[PDB]
Ligand binder design. Structure first.
Ligand code: HEM
Ligand code: TPF
Length: 528
């Protein structure tokens, strides 16, 4: 008689529901904790699954150590498991593929295999607005990148350089962090100055003088509000009844409203020329099926492009300053190149002369090697993927994680990878370059292979299109910094460690440097 056994099942069930509040809620804790550890041991038996990093807390997973020290977490998992391993992250299963072959597996994955918008829609749509970037089919994103790229030509860069130069000098003249007509030395926090110089130069060139003029008013507070809304918490809590989320959404409406106001006003006057990205998108935002971007979608695309380039570039110029602060030899070498190329300062900086400054461009290139602003890039796996030359299968619902910034710091591909050395790029100052064949995904021909160990701007269909703008912006800025100032650390201070917890791997602040004028008597003209 096993009939008695099922009776005692039912009996035991009723006795379970009659356990005290103390013991019951403890079982709601211990029974998933126990089952968590059982499932993992059964999981490590599957040979079609990459090894899974062990974790105690269910759902949370390895979130704590990945959030704080991802590159150290990756190297430990690489020593233990190899280049392909999975780990649980806040309810998601992340499959990491390290190395150049990991770059190929993710950046060159089939459009039907992975989705970037499935991974990033919650991070960006609340900040940027609806209809653009990752709130649309990939084919729409491909053409949006094509639209933006139309205002990112060599002709545009020739006009942006004197505009960006004016903004840098205006900042040297007017900002409390410098005031070079009143002070010959001072101390700045680079995480204060660089975001400000980044938005001032990006707005003036990409958005135009009207939008730049707004930043001198209370309107600049909205950018700060919207900027605060670009944060990793959106991956878990995209919308919560809080003040942070309200000022963010308010900023998005208010900022996009200002852009639409200018857009509708220019078309109201046929004041549509070739000045900025706004003119460009007004003349060139019709998809190939005939659908035209709305004024709201155009404005939202402006926010996303400007916000993305804001964080990557501001972090990068901060890192450049921090590495040069302890390298007066490099500052000295960069200065000589400035005197040679610009004829002792008698030549005005142009976009063509920027291209004749290899050491300056190598400095940017080396900084982007040691400080990739995006330490990890994600895709959600849409169809079950097989890893070549393995038996591994990444089932749909998993996420893949590619990390070129980790390969940037491996000695095998960059000897003495943790040494800052711009001369490792001698006779190779190009921001990046295709090492052979090419492919066009809808926004221009780009490298077909994505196997380079150096991928600061990614690769494949989601490859960056701001690379040449960033080098232009960083180049003009650093050319002026070099010619105007020397700088160094306060005694005992050095390059800070990266903050991997923010949206980009910016330096841990406050990161202070002491500037001093190369020409104490030099004055910056203009009224103020
Ligand atoms: C140092 C500066 C920058 C770096 C290192 C950088 C890096 C990257 C990387 C790695 C990606 C690939 C993202 C992925 O595959 O998921 C990307 C995408 C992109 N970036 Fe940049 N970026 C920089 C600046 C800029 C600027 C200045 C702009 C615009 C003016 C810009 C606009 C874009 C756009 C539109 C994409 C396309 C994203 C997609 O198609 O999914 N970026 N960037
Ligand atoms: O790729 C980003 C979004 N992102 C991914 N991981 C972290 N943030 C950042 N970015 C890359 N280059 C510039 N910004 C992006 C892409 C396009 C875009 F329009 C905005 C935007 F934030």
């Amino acid at each position: 008689i096993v009939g008695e056994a099922l009776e005692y099942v039912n009996i035991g069930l009723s006795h379970f529901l009659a356990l005290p509040l103390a013991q019951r809620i403890s079982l709601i804790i211990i029974i998933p904790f126990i089952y968590n550890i059982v499932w993992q041991l059964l999981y490590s038996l599957r040979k079609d699954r990459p090894p899974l990093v062990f974790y105690w807390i269910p759902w949370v997973g390895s979130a704590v150590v990945y959030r704080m020290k991802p590159y150290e977490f990756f190297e430990e998992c690489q020593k233990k498991y190899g280049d392909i391993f999975s780990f649980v992250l806040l309810g998601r299963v992340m499959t990491v593929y390290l190395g150049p072959k990991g770059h190929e597996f993710v950046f060159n994955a089939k459009l039907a295999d992975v989705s970037a918008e499935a991974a990033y829609a919650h991070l960006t749509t609340p900040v940027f607005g609806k209809g653009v970037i990752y709130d649309c089919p990939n084919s729409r994103l491909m053409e949006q990148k094509k639209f933006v790229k139309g205002a990112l030509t060599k002709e545009a860069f020739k006009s942006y350089v004197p505009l960006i130069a004016e903004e840098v000098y205006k900042y040297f003249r007017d900002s409390k962090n410098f005031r070079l007509n009143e002070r010959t030395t001072g101390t700045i926090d680079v995480m204060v100055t660089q975001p400000e110089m980044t938005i001032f130069t990006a707005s003036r060139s990409l958005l135009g003088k009207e939008m730049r003029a707004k930043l001198d008013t209370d309107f600049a507070y909205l950018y700060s509000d919207l900027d605060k809304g670009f944060t990793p918490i959106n991956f878990v809590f995209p919308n919560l009844p809080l003040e942070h989320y309200r000022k963010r959404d308010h900023a998005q409406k208010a900022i996009s409203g200002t852009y639409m106001s200018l857009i509708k006003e220019r078309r109201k006057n046929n004041d549509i020329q070739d000045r900025d990205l706004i003119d460009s998108l007004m003349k060139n935002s019709t998809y190939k099926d005939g659908v035209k971007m709305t004024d709201q979608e155009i404005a939202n695309l402006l926010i996303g492009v400007l916000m993305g380039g804001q964080h990557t570039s501001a972090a990068t110029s901060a890192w450049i300053l921090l590495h040069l602060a302890e390298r007066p030899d490099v500052q000295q070498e960069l200065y000589e190149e400035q005197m040679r190329v610009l004829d002792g300062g008698k030549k005005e900086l142009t976009y063509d002369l920027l291209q004749e400054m290899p050491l300056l461009n190598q400095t940017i290139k080396e900084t982007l090697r040691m400080h990739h602003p995006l330490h990890s890039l994600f895709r959600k796996v849409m169809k079950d993927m097989h890893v070549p030359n393995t038996s591994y299968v990444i089932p749909a619902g998993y996420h893949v994680l590619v990390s070129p910034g980790y390969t940037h710091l491996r000695d095998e591909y960059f000897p003495n990878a943790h040494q800052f050395n711009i001369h490792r790029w001698n006779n190779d100052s190009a921001s990046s370059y295709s090492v052979g064949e090419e492919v066009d995904y809808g926004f221009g021909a780009i490298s077909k292979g994505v196997s380079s160990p150096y991928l600061p701007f990614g690769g494949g269909r989601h490859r960056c299109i701001g690379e040449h703008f960033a080098y232009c912006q960083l180049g003009v800025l650093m050319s002026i910094f070099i010619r105007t100032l020397k700088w160094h650390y306060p005694e005992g201070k050095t390059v800070p460690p990266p903050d991997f917890t923010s949206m980009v791997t910016l330096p841990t602040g406050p990161a202070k440097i002491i500037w001093e004028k190369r020409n104490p008597e030099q004055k910056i003209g203009g009224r103020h």
